[PDB]
């Protein structure tokens, strides 16, 4: 744990002192607050520090003594909050108690100060929450009075209010709390605030939610006041349109008014006299109770609806006489009828009582009584929702009367709203639309847009009315003349800051612009400017931007660009006084730059440079109002216009970094929030610039990267600006196809990223973001793995592992980095190190050590491969042991201050580490299956039971997660699941939830663990029948129904969701529904339909439950209740694609085809159609929507609308083009419905199309028509995009002539600016490519518009949808050989050839899979089709540049769909056989394997998704084999990928199918791929994939095809026949052929027959050991490898050698027998295999050293032993071989025995020598230590062989072997015999002998020097005159030829004899030795072996010898060494380099 800031003790000291000195106190507390602020990385540690130093006892003294100072309060609550945080985390009881005793009263004082400060409140509210979570809640009643007093302060924020009201409610929930509020000013204090200040924002509603809950609880305790009900009613009225607040208002009201008063009220109205006090008071009371929805059903039950309708019926006759008394009655009664009309049952009753005719007739009497008219409109809205009642309401002339009333300006905005809502509700029915415009009053709505221009809030019904009517309008004239556009423009301006409301207005203006003559009425500039401003305000809203751009492309003009550009200069200068002026111009330059036909005008004026200079002026000056807004607007402006352009972005990117580094920026940001300020916005801006990849060039990238580092360097504590910079670095690294990675390294940015991560260990988003940069840089270039290691990246990610242990996102990020930096080869030894240390700690009683090493152990285990090491070395058995000990020794708790954690904190930590270890282990099949086999599912359960958690500690929550995330993994295996139930763990888990309240992670993991036991239907039923699981299910439902907290609702609902997604069982769904979930979830969508998050989560669960359960049955089979809820929420969430998808999904599951009439009655049709229109590019919306429309008029409406189009274009009305447009538009919605009878539905599809072709040819340029006709054709093409036989689709489009029409339209460039036509049009093009019957005419048509398709792409490069549609068309088009040719020859232009453009596009939409996948698939198809048609390859593909660019688009977290498309691209490139050079150069295959490797580390995809990746990889390797790149696959572990696929997917037929075809193609490509398939892959197929080949027809048939390829080559049948499991596999195939037993089964049978016959004919087994040798020898001769690792065909040859030899070794062998000489050849064969270091571990596995030693010892024939000696002698050349050889018991004595036998034998001296050399050679290599051969008589045998030589008959070669072995065995133990045999004297004698054999002297000199290793021999050498004999020899030989090895070896002898020896160094000096050394250097210094040894002598003479240092300084040695240095001139030969070194 970290240390606190030292200055905290000086701050605490300052406030302890100066408690009284107020200004000094404020300094100290202000200082202590900043130490306790989260900006400090040590805020928790500092706060704990201030606690321990005793500051609260001073702070409490201060808040009391100075209760009036708010500044104290802000600082005090900050310190206290930070404590509570660190308190909750530490879970030290000592502290939690203290902070609650000494600390709680501090905050109680802050609360009783009526704080108004958002931070003071927020810190205080968060204090009590954390204290409660810590087990020390602050009494809510002690805080209730002060919190309530917060509301007498008028200017309180809504965000602060909501937090406080939520607390009051919880406080009031008790008797003590309600009482405190009651006596501290009652409900009026709160409710008065809600009324006088409350608003209708999301937070104002959430606030009033809590206020109503507060009143409700006080009502339960009789703490309400006579003012409460009235104020509650008036708040109900205020929040009428928001059901979340209304529902909690009626709940509160229900608690003030019992059910007893309802019945008395109604019975009083039935009996009491008319006009009496009791009647009047009863009717008033009934008004109040009409606000209670739980009473509204009681009113209807007791005939109250007729009573209210009678009041109106009987009142209208009386209106003439008393108009005002009657209007009031009507108002009151009609409002009650409006509130009664909630349920569909309630609306039924109103309708049964003649409500419609009553209300409508009353409207006809109240045309001059506005209040009553509004109440009547309010009662008709819910009735007009039904189509049939709205028809009745038209019949009665209501709309025809309310419209002229609005047309004359209803003054009250309240009445006007209710009246627009009614006309809007009615307009949502298609048949009432035609009435409300086509009959009359189309423009009456338009003129009303102009009246309450700014009122629109819930009153957006003026927009919606024209939004449902403009599609029908055939002209904008009326809407313009009446001022409709002016009113909507004027509306958007006012409401421009409300996002939702302005998206609606921009959509309405977009629809206006589609009208045919709309350019003539909206081209004055006022419409443009209102849209541009809106687009700049809401760039985050894709729907607003997209609608705005459609509109501008139609109406915006050049003059719009000129009139804003002309004022740019002036507007920038006058921005201080007139900031709006420059804002408007910026909005126009930004938005109009998105219009393709207008972009260039702003760059031809270099407006970007001007705006950038203007930003600097606005910063380098005095701060003025609007300065922030203006700078942020200009930053967004310059970003948008550069992105929309196509120039390089370096200059602008640098200018934005420079702007951020201006000295005044710090000042400007002081006054803002840290999240939103100009610095954060500037970094976000130049990040988006970098994301485009339009920064090219080493110079430029360096500039841009330096600039980013400057920003990071200059603002160290702007943590949102730090993030944006890290992201920017990620992008810049990818620029130039990854070459930005090199720039990022050599500028130091890689290390800067590491440095920042080390600085900010607490910031999780920064860890992920920073490691992403590093992972991106590694994946692109693994050469930066070295740099990251030297930057200490490993320690940094080690720290983030431990800090954010529960972050799954932080780990999929760092996973590749650990593998790269982890010691790749030191693991197997280091894991077994900690494995044994942990076990040892358990053997003792050392509980600390277990933790310490389990902690370190986990760090190692993270390595994916390292996790497989631990599993392989028996960690599971280890783990079961650790648990046995941990759970037993809990009294070890008392560690007694001997470790970092003590007490119970230490027990849970060990449990946590033990559990975490098994968690990493269970990553892949290797680990998870090892733990299961060990019984670890039992050890985990035992571990979790050891977490009894009597008192929560700060490692226990994490201990549970690890424990439960484990069993999620392990229990998913069927056998282990039943053990769980056996242990009664379901109950132990459920109690585990209630043990740890407030922990959403435990709840989630406990539920995922519960479902993991219910893998099958039997266990699902076991689970849901458990009582504890029943009580859990109900307490989750309870939380969804009563907990106000939105977050707890989302958590509960998520828990339920997973239970149904995992188990996926009709019994889970059934039990969840019956627990109350269906009604409770629909209630969420009914009350919280305005909240996207709650509505989406609720819908998600209901759709899951609705797939098994008939949802309507929970509403008594009346589907209208839930359907209305779904439709209501659907309309509120219209513009949230995600919410629309899930609402339509519950609707489509709730309803059936037998609901056609119920669904039409509710207008569901138009609501669904409206959605499909807005989200027209959402695949999900169009699917669900169509499926719903199949329930509401399948086939019928389609047939009728088509015929109607023919009737129209035949007559020839003046307005046909306009008329059919609205027909086509209606049709496209239906053409999305699945058609069960395509024949009938699409009868007239070819003529209908032919009639549209005519309509288009006579009415060109009708933009809207052109668009809707494209949409229908896409819907026709989409429904049979794959069935090339269907005639009612893409075929029809071509037959009828449309296909040629569309092509002409695009060829004429008339449409290029119309994106609503180009998208669908190019989708239908794509369809006519897919259908092979349409292709010939597509080819016949395309050349006329392919160049336009290019220019089209450059235009719309910024539109992802248009780009994706065009690139997709090119993908399919490129399949035809003529097409792909036309593409390359016609699509070339300003952006390069078609390939360059495609890259540019993907780079711009790098975040968009649809564009990227379409682009890669396109390049793939194009490259391949071109090669097969004879065309020439694509230069930039053959260049390797596109591969680098495409690799850059592949980030470490790119989706699976993008990985597949990238693999398909590479596959197609390989199949074309045209790009091998580039594919090898850029290492495509290696990178693909790496990526696939990473996805098994991360383990983020689903097993089905990885199935596709491996299946896809199998196909890539298949193409590689065909391409001739098997050499490439072996550089990396290519083949191993197929083996991995077999092991993990052996049960997946679709993987093994591709694996078989891959192995077949690899084999027939290469002989060594054939071998590895036989020896490695087929054994896996016949065992790990045997059931798949057996059960799946395609695996069986492809396996037979592969076997037939393998057996077709001699020798393979023999080896396959011996493959384990092949017979079981072949037989089951036959079994399979019997089942199908048709032409396929007969064919499969013949294949097995051929396979068996081939293996029988190829069962020779014809080979001996001499064969394996003659073969190996031929290779070694020819120069080939004999490494089995690298030459797979030698695998069999070695298996045979081990077997034949192993069997020869059973007997004694005569070398002159067939098997003896063959035993010789086998050992000569091994000897060649031993010459290679790779074979050492193969031979080591087969006991090579052990065999040979047995032969040498056992075999009595010396000629058999000879060749065993040699074979072992070569194996021992390599140290690790000699290590094992010489280490096995007896080897030294045995090898020496072999030596002895030959000295005592009586052989010819000829062979006696051969045997001695070889066996003494073995002695040399085996003598790894000098003390190894001590106990054996090796010295005796060496001396006897020497003595035999002195008698003669041996050559000098033997003596050299005697000497070589002697220096290895010479030791203190043989010293006595060395002196007896006078070895020294003999060697001295040979040295002195002037006739000595020159071939023997070098070894003599060498042995003599080596013998000096023994301290006693060293001295004897001097006493025996060895040094003088050596100096004499050196003098002798120096001038002679052929003496270089003597001079060399005599100098080394000198050095070894004197190095640290005072006696011999003085002998050597007196002989003139030092001068001689220098003479060997002056002479013969140019000889490198000589010069090297001479220099080695100098060093040894100098070592620890000052006098030699002085002597050789004046001896002339320095000048001699200088000459040795100068002899060099360039040689890098190994010899000249060792010389130069010495
Ligand atoms: K009361
Ligand atoms: K308006």
The ligand with the least distance to the CA atom of 228 is 1
Cα 242 to middle of ligand 1, angstroms:
29
Place of tokens 């909507």: 488
- Tell me, in angstroms, the distance from the centre of ligand 2 to residue 555's CA: 22
Who contacts 930 (Cβ-Cβ below 8 Å, separation ≥6)?
A: 871, 872, 875, 876, 921
Helices (H), 566-664: 568-573, 579-592, 600-603, 607-619, 627-644, 650-660
Query: In sequence order, what are the beta bridge partners of 1389?
Result: 1392
**HSE, side-chain direction, 13 A CA sphere, residue 671:** 12
Q: Using CB atoms within 10 A of its CB, is residue 608 exposed (0-12), middle (13-18) or buried (19+)? A: buried
Residue-wise over 482-494: b if at least 16 C-beta within 10 A, else e?
Answer: bbbbbbbbbbbbe
Q: Which two tokens stand for residue 418?
A: 């209710």
User: Rounded distance, CA 377 to CA 383, Å?
Assistant: 10
Phi first, then psi, for residue 1784 (nearest 5°) are -70, 140
Question: Distance (Å, rounded) from C-alpha 1201 to C-alpha 345?
Answer: 35
With beta carbons less than 8 A apart as the criterion, state whether 1964 and 2001 touch.
no
Distances in Å between the Cα of 984 and the Cα atoms of 680, 933, 978, 1012, 1804 are 54, 21, 10, 14, 84
How many whole angstroms separate alpha carbon 1145 and alpha carbon 1164? 13
- Distance from C-alpha of 14 to C-alpha of 11, rounded to nearest angstrom: 5
CB of 785 closer than 8 Å to CB of 778: yes
CA of 230 from ligand 1 middle (Å) equals: 14
Ligand nearest to the CA of 229: 1
Taking CA atoms, 1316 is separated from 511, 531, 541, 1277, 1615, in Å, by 12, 19, 19, 17, 65
Closest-approaching ligand to the CA atom of 220: 1
For 1523-1550, b where at least 16 C-beta lie within 10 A, e where not — what string?
Answer: bebbebbbebebbebbbbbbebbbebbb
477 alpha carbon – ligand 2 mean position (Å): 19
Phi-psi region of 2019 (alpha: psi -120 to 50; beta: other; left: phi over 0): alpha
Q: Which ligand is nearest to the CA of 219?
A: 1
Question: 1965 and 1957 in contact (C-beta within 8 Å)?
Answer: no
Lookup: tokens for 146: 């002060």
User: What is the Å distance from ligand 1's center to 698 Cα?
Assistant: 79
Using N-to-C axis directions, what is the helix angle for 187-196 and 140-149, rounded to 10°?
40
- The rounded Å distance from CA 226 to ligand 1 centre is 8
Q: Choose among 612, 467, 596: nearest CA to 1355.
A: 596
Q: How far is the CA of 254 from the centre of ligand 1 (A)?
A: 15
Ligand nearest to the CA of 446: 2
For residues 1877 and 1839, the answer to whether their CB atoms sit within 8 Å is yes
Distance of CA 162 from the midpoint of ligand 1 (Å): 25
Q: Are 1127 and 1133 in contact (CB under 8 A)?
A: no
Instruction: Report the candidate in 519, 620, 521, 604 with the shortest Cα–Cα distance to residue 561.
Output: 604
Measured CA to CA, the distance from residue 1215 to residue 1264 in angstroms comes to 14
CA angle, 1158 as apex, 1152 and 1163 as ends, to 5°? Answer: 110
DSSP run (H or E) holding 1099: helix 1092-1105
**Can you tell me the distance from the alpha carbon of 489 to that of 467, in angstroms, rounded to the nearest whole number?**
14
Residues 6+ apart with CB under 8 A from 1370: 1349, 1383, 1394, 1398, 1418, 1422
Q: How large is the angle between the packed helices 749-759 and 698-714, nearest 10 degrees? A: 20
Please give the helix or strand (H or E) that residue 1088 lies within, else none: none
Structure solved via:
X-ray
Rounded CA-CA distance 112/180 in Å is: 13
Ligand nearest to the CA of 186: 1
Listed resolution, Å: 2.3
Q: What is the 3-state secondary structure (H, E, C) of 189-217?
A: HHHHHHHHCCCCCHHHHHHHHHHHHHHHH
Q: How far apart are CA 1712 and CA 1178, in angstroms?
A: 85
> How remote is the CA of residue 495 from the centroid of ligand 2, in Å?
9
Q: Which residues surround ligand 2, an ion (CB under 5 A)?
A: 449, 453, 462, 491
d(CA 1760, CA 681): 84
Pure H helices in 1532-1621:
1535-1545, 1549-1563, 1567-1572, 1578-1584, 1586-1591, 1593-1607, 1612-1617
CA of 453 to the centre of ligand 2 (A): 4
State whether the Cα torsion 216-220-221-225 is positive or negative.
Answer: positive
Report whether 108 contacts 138 (CB < 8 A). Answer: yes
Rounded to the nearest angstrom, the distance between the alpha carbon of 476 and the centre of ligand 2 is 18
Is residue 509 a contact partner of residue 531, using CB atoms and an 8 Å limit?
A: yes
Q: Which ligand is nearest to the CA of 453?
A: 2
CA distance 2034 to 1203: 96
Give the single-character DSSP code of 396: T
For residue 791, give Cα distances in angstroms to 41, 783, 786: 22, 14, 9
Closest CA to 1373 of 1423, 1413, 1329, 1420: 1329
CA–centroid distance, residue 193 to ligand 1 (Å): 21
If you measure from the C-alpha of residue 253 to the centroid of ligand 1, how many angstroms do you get, rounded to a whole number?
14
Token representation of residue 1042? 């009563």
The ligand with the least distance to the CA atom of 223 is 1
Whether residue 1853 contacts residue 1813, with contact meaning beta carbons closer than 8 Å, is answered with: yes
Angle at 721 between CA 720 and CA 722, to 5 degrees: 90
Query: How many angstroms does the Cα of residue 498 sit away from the middle of ligand 2?
Result: 14
Let me know if 1689 is exposed, middle or buried by CB neighbors in 10 A (0-12, 13-18, 19+).
middle
Do residues 574 and 537 make contact, with C-beta atoms less than 8 angstroms apart? no
- Residue reference for tokens 């994706």: 1364
First to last CA, the chain: 50
Sign, Cα dihedral of 1356, 1358, 1360, 1363 = positive
Name the residue among 1521, 1520, 1525, 1454 with its Cα closest to residue 1492.
Answer: 1454
Structure tokens at 1574: 């036989």
CA distances from 1232 to 126, 1136, 1181, 1239, 1271 (A): 51, 21, 10, 16, 10
CA distance 460 to 425: 12
Considering every ligand atom, which ligand is closest to the CA of 490? 2
Sign of the torsion formed by the C-alpha atoms of 1892, 1894, 1896 and 1900: positive
Q: Which residues lie closer than 8 Å to 1405 by C-beta, 6 or more apart?
A: 1360, 1363, 1364, 1411, 1412
Which residues are bridge partners to 1743 per DSSP? none
CA of 1267 to the centre of ligand 2 (A): 29
């Amino acid at each position: 744990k970290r240390n606190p800031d030292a200055g905290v003790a000086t701050a605490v000291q300052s406030v302890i002192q100066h408690q009284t000195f107020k200004r000094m106190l404020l300094f100290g507390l202000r200082s202590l607050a900043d130490f306790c602020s989260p900006s400090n990385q040590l805020y928790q540690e500092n706060a704990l520090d201030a606690l321990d130093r005793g500051v609260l006892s001073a702070i409490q003294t201060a808040v009391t003594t100075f209760s009036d100072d708010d500044d104290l309060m802000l600082c005090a609550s900050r310190v206290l909050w930070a404590m509570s945080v660190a308190i909750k985390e530490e879970m030290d009881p000592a502290h939690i108690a203290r902070v609650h005793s000494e600390g709680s009263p501090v905050i109680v004082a802050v609360v009783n100060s009526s704080p108004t400060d958002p931070q003071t409140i927020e810190d205080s509210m968060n204090f009590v929450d954390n204290l409660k979570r810590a087990g020390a809640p602050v009494d809510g009643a002690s805080l209730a009075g002060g919190m309530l007093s917060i509301f007498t302060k008028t200017a309180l924020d809504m965000k602060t209010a909501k937090r406080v009201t939520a607390a009051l409610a919880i406080a009031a929930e008790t008797a003590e709390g309600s009482t405190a509020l009651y006596n501290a000013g009652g409900t009026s204090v709160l409710l008065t605030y809600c009324l006088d200040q409350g608003d209708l924002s999301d937070a104002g509603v959430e606030m009033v939610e809590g206020a109503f809950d507060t009143v409700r609880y006080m009502a339960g305790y009789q703490c309400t006041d006579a003012t409460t009900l009235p104020q509650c009613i008036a708040l109900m009225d205020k929040y009428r349109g928001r059901k979340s607040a209304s529902a909690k208002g009626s709940s509160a009201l229900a608690a003030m008014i019992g059910p007893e008063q309802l019945q008395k009220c109604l019975n009083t109205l039935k009996t009491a006299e008319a006009g009496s006090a009791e009647y009047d008071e009863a009717l008033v009371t009934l008004g109040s109770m009409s606000y209670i929805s739980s009473f509204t059903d009681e009113i209807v039950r007791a005939g109250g609806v007729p009573l209210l309708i009678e009041l109106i019926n009987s009142g209208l006759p009386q209106m003439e006489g008393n108009p005002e008394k009657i209007a009031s009655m009507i108002s009151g009664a009609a409002k009650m009828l409006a509130r009664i009309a909630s349920n569909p049952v309630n609306v039924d009753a109103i309708v049964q009582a003649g409500g419609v005719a009553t209300l409508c007739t009353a409207v006809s009497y109240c045309t001059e009584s506005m209040e009553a008219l509004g109440a009547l409109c309010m009662a008709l809205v819910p009735l007009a929702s039904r189509e049939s009642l709205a028809h009745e309401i038209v019949q009665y002339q209501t709309f025809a009367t309310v419209l002229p009333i609005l047309y004359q300006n209803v003054e009250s905005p309240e009445i006007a709203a209710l009246a627009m809502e009614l006309v809007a509700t009615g307009s949502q029915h298609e048949e009432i639309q035609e009435h409300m415009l086509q009959n009359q009053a189309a423009e009456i709505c338009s003129l009303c847009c102009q009246y309450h221009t700014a009122d629109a809030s819930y009153q957006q019904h003026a927009i919606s009315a024209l939004n449902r009517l403009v599609p029908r309008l055939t002209t904008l004239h009326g809407v313009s003349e009446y001022g409709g556009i002016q009113g909507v423009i004027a509306s958007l301006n006012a409401n421009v800051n409300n996002e939702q409301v302005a998206l609606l207005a921009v959509q309405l203006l977009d629809n206006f612009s589609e009208v045919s003559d709309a350019k003539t009425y909206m081209s004055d500039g006022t419409c443009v400017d209102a849209v541009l401003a809106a687009m700049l305000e809401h760039e985050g809203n894709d729907l607003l931007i997209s609608a705005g751009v459609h509109c501008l492309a139609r109406i915006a003009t050049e003059d719009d660009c000129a009139r804003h550009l002309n004022v740019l200069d002036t507007a920038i200068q006058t921005a201080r006084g007139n900031p709006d002026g420059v804002y408007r111009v910026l909005a126009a330059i930004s938005g109009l730059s998105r219009v393709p036909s207008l972009r260039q005008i702003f760059e031809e004026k270099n407006a970007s440079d001007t705006i950038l200079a203007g930003i600097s002026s606005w910063i380098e000056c005095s701060r003025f109002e609007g300065q922030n807004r203006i700078i942020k607007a200009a930053l967004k402006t310059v970003k948008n216009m550069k992105i929309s352009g196509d120039g390089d972005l370096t200059s602008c990117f640098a200018a934005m970094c420079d702007v951020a580094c201006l000295p005044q920026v710090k000042r400007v940001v002081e006054l803002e929030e840290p999240d939103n300020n100009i610095l954060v916005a500037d970094t976000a801006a130049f990040r988006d610039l970098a994301a485009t990849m339009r920064i090219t060039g080493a110079e430029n990238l360096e500039r841009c990267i330096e600039s980013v580092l400057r920003v990071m360097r200059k603002y160290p504590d702007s943590r949102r600006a730090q993030l944006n910079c890290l992201e920017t670095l990620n992008y810049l690294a990818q620029c130039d196809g990854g070459e930005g990675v090199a720039i990022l390294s050599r500028t130091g940015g890689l290390n800067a990223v590491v440095q920042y991560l080390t600085r900010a260990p607490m910031y999780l988003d920064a860890q992920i973001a920073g490691f992403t940069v590093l992972a991106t840089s590694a994946k692109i270039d693994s050469n930066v793995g070295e740099t990251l290691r030297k930057c200490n990246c490993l320690q940094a990610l080690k720290v983030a592992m431990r800090t954010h242990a529960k972050s799954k996102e932080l780990k999929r990020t760092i996973a590749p980095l650990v593998a790269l930096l982890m010691p790749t080869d030191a693991l197997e030894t280091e894991i077994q190190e900690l494995l044994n240390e942990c076990a040892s700690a358990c053997e003792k009683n050392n509980f600390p050590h277990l933790h310490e090493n389990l902690a370190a152990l986990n760090e190692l285990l993270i390595s994916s491969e390292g996790a497989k090491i631990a599993a392989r070395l028996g960690i599971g058995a280890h783990m079961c042991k650790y648990q046995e000990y941990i759970s037993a020794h809990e009294q070890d708790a008392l560690a007694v201050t001997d470790y970092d954690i003590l007490g119970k904190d230490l027990f849970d930590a060990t449990v946590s580490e033990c559990a975490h270890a098994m968690e990493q282990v269970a990553s892949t099949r290797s680990g998870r299956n090892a733990l299961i086999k060990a019984g670890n599912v039992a050890t985990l359960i035992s571990l979790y039971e050891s977490l009894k958690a009597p008192q929560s500690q700060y490692s226990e929550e994490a201990a549970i997660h690890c424990l439960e995330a484990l069993r999620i993994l392990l229990k998913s295996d069927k056998r282990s699941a039943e053990l769980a139930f056996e242990r009664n763990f379901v109950s132990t888990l459920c109690v585990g939830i209630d043990s740890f309240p407030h922990s959403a992670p435990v709840l989630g993991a406990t539920c995922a663990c519960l479902a993991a036991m219910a893998t099958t239907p039997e266990r699902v039923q076991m689970l849901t029948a458990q009582p504890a699981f029943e009580s859990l299910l109900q307490k989750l439902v309870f939380v969804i129904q009563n907990d106000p907290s939105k977050d707890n609702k989302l958590v509960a609902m998520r828990a339920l969701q997973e239970l149904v997604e995992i188990t996926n069982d009709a019994t889970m769904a059934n039990k969840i529904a019956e627990a109350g979930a269906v009604t409770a979830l629909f209630r969420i969508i009914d009350e919280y339909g305005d909240d996207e998050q709650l509505t989406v989560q609720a819908a998600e669960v209901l759709a899951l439950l609705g797939a098994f359960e008939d949802l309507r049955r929970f509403y008594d089979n009346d589907v209208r209740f839930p359907a209305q809820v779904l439709t209501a929420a659907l309309t509120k969430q219209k513009n949230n694609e995600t919410a629309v998808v899930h609402l339509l999904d519950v609707l489509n599951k709730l309803a059936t085809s037998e609901d056609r009439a119920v669904l039409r009655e509710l207008g569901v049709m138009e609501q669904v159609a409206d959605a499909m229109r807005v989200h027209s590019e959402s695949e999900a919306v169009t699917r669900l929507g169509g499926e719903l429309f199949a329930k509401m008029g399948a086939d019928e409406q389609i047939k009728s609308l088509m015929l109607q189009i023919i009737e129209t274009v035949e007559s020839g009305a003046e307005d046909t083009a306009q008329t059919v447009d609205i027909l086509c538009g209606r049709l496209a919605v239906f053409l999305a419905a699945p058609l069960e009878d395509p024949r009938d539905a699409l009868q007239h599809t070819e003529k209908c199309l032919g009639s549209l072709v005519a309509t288009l040819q006579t009415y060109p340029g009708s933009e809207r028509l052109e668009g809707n006709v494209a949409l229908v054709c896409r819907r026709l093409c989409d429904r049979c995009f794959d069935d090339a036989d269907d005639p009612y689709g893409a075929w029809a489009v071509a037959a009828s002539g449309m296909l040629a029409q569309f092509a002409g339209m695009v060829a004429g460039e008339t449409v290029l600016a119309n994106k609503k036509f180009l998208g669908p049009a190019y989708r239908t093009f794509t369809a006519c490519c897919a259908n092979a019957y349409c292709m010939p005419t597509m080819v016949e048509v395309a050349p006329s518009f392919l160049p336009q398709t290019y220019t089209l792409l450059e235009m719309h490069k910024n539109d992802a949808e248009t780009v994706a549609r065009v690139l997709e068309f090119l993908r399919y088009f490129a399949e035809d050989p003529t097409a792909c040719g036309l593409i390359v020859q016609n699509m070339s232009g300003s952006s390069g050839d078609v390939v360059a453009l495609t890259v540019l596009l993907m780079q711009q939409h790098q975040n968009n899979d649809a564009v990227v996948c379409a682009g890669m698939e396109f390049l793939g198809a194009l490259a391949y089709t071109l090669s097969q048609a004879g065309y020439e390859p694509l230069p930039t593909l053959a260049d390797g540049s596109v591969l680098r660019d495409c690799d850059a688009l592949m980030g470490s977290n790119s989706s699976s769909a993008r990985q597949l498309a990238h693999m398909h691209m590479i596959e197609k490139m390989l199949l074309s056989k045209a790009y091998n050079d580039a594919l090898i150069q850029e290492q495509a295959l290696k990178k693909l394997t790496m990526s696939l490797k990473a996805e098994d580390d991360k383990k983020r995809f689903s097993d089905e998704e990885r199935a596709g990746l491996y299946a896809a990889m199998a196909c890539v390797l298949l193409a590689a084999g065909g391409a001739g790149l098997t050499g490439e696959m072996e550089k990396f572990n290519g083949f191993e990928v197929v083996l991995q696929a077999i092991e993990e997917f052996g049960e997946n037929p679709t993987v093994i199918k591709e694996v078989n075809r891959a192995l077949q193609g690899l084999s027939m490509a290469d002989v060594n791929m054939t071998a590895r398939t036989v020896k490695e892959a087929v054994p896996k197929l016949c065992t790990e994939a045997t059931t798949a080949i057996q059960t799946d027809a395609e695996c069986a048939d492809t396996f037979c095809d592969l076997m037939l390829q393998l057996v077709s080559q001699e020798g393979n049948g023999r080896q396959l026949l011996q493959v384990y499991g092949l017979e079981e596999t072949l037989q089951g195939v036959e079994n399979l052929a019997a089942y199908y037993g048709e032409d396929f089964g007969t064919q499969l049978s013949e294949k097995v027959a051929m396979i068996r016959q081939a293996m029988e004919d190829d069962q020779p087994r014809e080979k001996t050991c001499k064969d394996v040798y003659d073969l190996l020898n031929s290779r070694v001769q020819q120069g080939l490898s004999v490494a089995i690792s690298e030459v797979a065909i030698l695998q069999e040859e070695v298996e045979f050698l081990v077997s034949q030899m192993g069997m020869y070794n059973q007997e004694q062998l005569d070398h002159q027998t067939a098997m003896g000489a063959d035993h010789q050849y086998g050992n000569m064969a091994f000897e060649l295999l031993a010459a290679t270091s790779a074979n050492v571990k193969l031979l080591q596995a087969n006991e090579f050293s052990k065999m040979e030693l047995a032969l040498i010892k056992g075999q009595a024939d010396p000629e058999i032993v000879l060749y065993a000696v040699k074979a072992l002698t070569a194996f021992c050349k390599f140290p690790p071989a000699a290590q094992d050889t010489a280490r096995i018991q007896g080897c030294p004595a045995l090898v020496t025995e072999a030596c002895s036998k030959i000295n005592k034998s009586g052989l010819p001296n000829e062979r006696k020598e051969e045997h001695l050399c070889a066996r003494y050679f073995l002695v040399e290599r085996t003598a790894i230590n000098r003390n190894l051969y001590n106990k054996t008589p090796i010295m005796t045998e060496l001396i006897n062989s020497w003595n035999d030589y002195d008698k003669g008959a041996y050559t000098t070669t033997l003596l050299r072997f005697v000497f070589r072995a002697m220096r290895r065995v010479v030791s203190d133990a043989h010293v006595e015999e060395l002196l007896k045999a006078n070895v020294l004297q003999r060697l001295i004698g040979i040295i002195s002998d002037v006739n000595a054999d020159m071939a023997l002297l070098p070894d003599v000199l060498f042995l003599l020097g080596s013998l000096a290793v023994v301290p006693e021999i060293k001295t004897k050498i001097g006493e025996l005159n060895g040094i003088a004999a050596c100096t004499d020899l050196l003098q002798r030989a120096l001038p002679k030829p052929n003496t270089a090895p003597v001079v060399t070896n005599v100098c080394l002898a000198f050095a070894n004899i004197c190095i640290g020896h005072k006696k011999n160094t003085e002998i050597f000096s007196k002989l003139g030795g030092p001068a001689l050394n220098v003479k060997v250097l002056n002479d013969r210094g140019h000889e490198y072996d000589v010069c090297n040894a001479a220099s080695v002598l100098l060093c040894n003479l100098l070592y620890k010898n000052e006098s030699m240092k002085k002597l050789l300084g004046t001896n002339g040695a320095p000048a001699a060494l200088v000459k040795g240095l100068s002899n060099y001139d360039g040689s890098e030969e190994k010899t000249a380099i060792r010389c130069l070194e010495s």
